[PDB]
Design a protein around this ligand. Structure first.
Ligand code: DST
Ligand code: DST
Ligand code: IPR
Ligand code: IPR
Ligand code: MG
Ligand code: MG
Ligand code: MG
Ligand code: MG
Ligand code: MG
Ligand code: MG
Lengths: 298, 300
């Protein structure tokens, strides 16, 4: 039952984040309230899911995986807070609630996003991960940083800002999505595998292919749902991309062709999972998620 | 012997070289966002935090080349913090380091992402850069420290209290709290990163180096408050009376100029008292003595 595994992942990840947010100073001040709101209230937690599902393949303990799970979700949550700001996408709705900058003001959203970024790295450097070597811990931190910064998520966000109003062609659009979305999703998978020493790293070339495909599919589905989704189901505004002239898969290719591309990427993702079930790994959660990425309505 | 003004410039040249070396391999060169990081990180600034890193590591025989990593890292964090600080939602400044601020020059969006990227870059340097005499444990401790000094327990927490204190004329203890977090934490991290580069010898010095750093840390910000009142815009690189314009809670606003000055003097008195304990173990404290003094003698 995949919806129960989602649900359980959400609960598990939220307690992980709360564990790491609890010892922080300034509890019940605006800025920290904004971090909790942005990190913990709503969300599918698909990236934590990727961390846990990857790590679980190699038999690493869930409790260990809480660290990298919470960390990728901190980067993710920070990314949404900034992405909603007036200078960026100017959204007032996210996860069925007023966005961070709307409820707490711009200054607090900005700072809460900054602080969440930093918390991702406190967690990866300070958290208990019993069976993870120092060298491996450094590799997780290195990967998360590269995936989140100008070579990954921030760099894609900048390609996205520059492509507003230009209706860039397919190759450039692929480049935007792979960076702004794909990179962090590949970091999730990679953090899961990096928790698992030699066997985890032996799976990386293939898990990489898997991650690059679901990562891109995830963003084209995000683009598709922006066009055809209900504001009430999505938790954020239908038509937000059209309204700003964002370059997207549906705007360029139309809906049918964009759905077709997302399906091609999941077919390919499934091929890469087929190679892992040959290294004796149980890919069942990673397959269910890959389907879910393009079948979901939120 | 020792000629502070040329050490300061050599440190700027060395830190800029280090920053540059870590930015060059990055993708999207000559695009608005990397232009914004380069502008905000490299064009001007005193590089006092890198000075702290270098000077501290040098006391323990640590190689300058190794120290380029933590030093560029603390300066990456510092630079990001300024870009976000000047934003219209924050301090709404149009002028820094003699030039238009990143948001005026590049747009708000580009300034937010440049800042975001510079923070991340800080952690990519500490995780990736070569640091041959530094152990894994010490590199993790460098990351953990920069992290807790940069976020809500340090610089960001400090910026949020600063923002909350606008128009609220907070008393001395709450003002000290603001300054120790928003400014102190990162200067202390520069010192800690220098010491952690030296492994065990550096760790044994931390209790004391912390006392030093805690005092120059606070001093830094009270002198920054004083300079906001009495400084020439053209010398500061930033607008005189910006604090007074936003109702910021500052040392001079609360205590007046004489008393803020005296508090800065007293904190450097204390900072140099701590450094005497380190010179007693035959560590050369002269560069940190000199910097402590420059922190309240400076006019920018
Ligand atoms: C926020 C980041 C880095 C990426 C996602 S793209 P987006 O602006 O389309 O995201 P939403 O549709 O706003 O959820
Ligand atoms: C920029 C950070 C984190 C702290 C310093 S306080 P400030 O806003 O007074 O600094 P400036 O005077 O704007 O340089
Ligand atoms: C497309 C994207 C990177 C922005 C939102 O991603 P998401 O649909 O996983 O958002 P949630 O965390 O709210 O589920
Ligand atoms: C007061 C403060 C922490 C912000 C500016 O610090 P600073 O005077 O070192 O600024 P520079 O990097 O421009 O020298
Ligand atoms: Mg958005
Ligand atoms: Mg966006
Ligand atoms: Mg979208
Ligand atoms: Mg300020
Ligand atoms: Mg300011
Ligand atoms: Mg100031």
């Amino acid at each position: 039952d995949f919806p129960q595994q989602l649900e359980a992942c959400v609960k598990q990840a939220n307690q992980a984040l709360s564990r790491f947010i609890a010892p922080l100073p300034f509890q019940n001040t605006p800025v920290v309230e904004t971090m909790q709101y942005g990190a913990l209230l709503g969300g599918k937690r698909l990236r934590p899911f990727l961390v846990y599902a990857t790590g679980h393949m190699f038999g690493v303990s869930t409790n260990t995986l809480d660290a990298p799970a919470a960390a990728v979700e901190c980067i993710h949550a920070y990314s949404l807070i900034h992405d909603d700001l007036p200078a960026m996408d100017d959204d007032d709705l996210r996860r069925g609630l007023p966005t961070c900058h709307v409820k707490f003001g711009e200054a607090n959203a900005i700072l809460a996003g900054d602080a969440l970024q930093t918390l991702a790295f406190s967690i990866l450097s300070d958290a208990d991960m019993p069976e993870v070597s120092d060298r491996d811990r450094i590799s997780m931190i290195s990967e998360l940083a590269s995936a989140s910064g100008i070579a990954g998520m921030c760099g894609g966000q900048a390609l996205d800002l520059d492509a507003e109003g230009k209706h860039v062609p397919l190759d450039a659009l692929e480049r935007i999505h792979r960076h702004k979305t794909g990179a962090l999703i590949r970091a999730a998978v990679r953090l899961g595998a990096l928790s698992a020493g030699d066997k985890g790293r032996r799976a990386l070339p293939v898990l990489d292919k898997y991650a690059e495909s679901i990562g891109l599919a995830f963003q084209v589905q995000d683009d598709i749902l922006d066009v055809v989704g209900d504001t009430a189901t999505l938790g954020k505004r239908q038509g937000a991309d059209q309204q700003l002239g964002k370059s997207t898969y549906p705007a360029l290719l139309g809906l049918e062709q964009a759905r077709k591309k997302a399906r091609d990427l999941i077919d390919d993702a499934r091929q890469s999972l087929k190679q892992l079930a040959e290294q004796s790994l149980d890919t069942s959660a990673l397959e269910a998620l890959a389907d879910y990425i393009i079948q979901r309505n939120k």
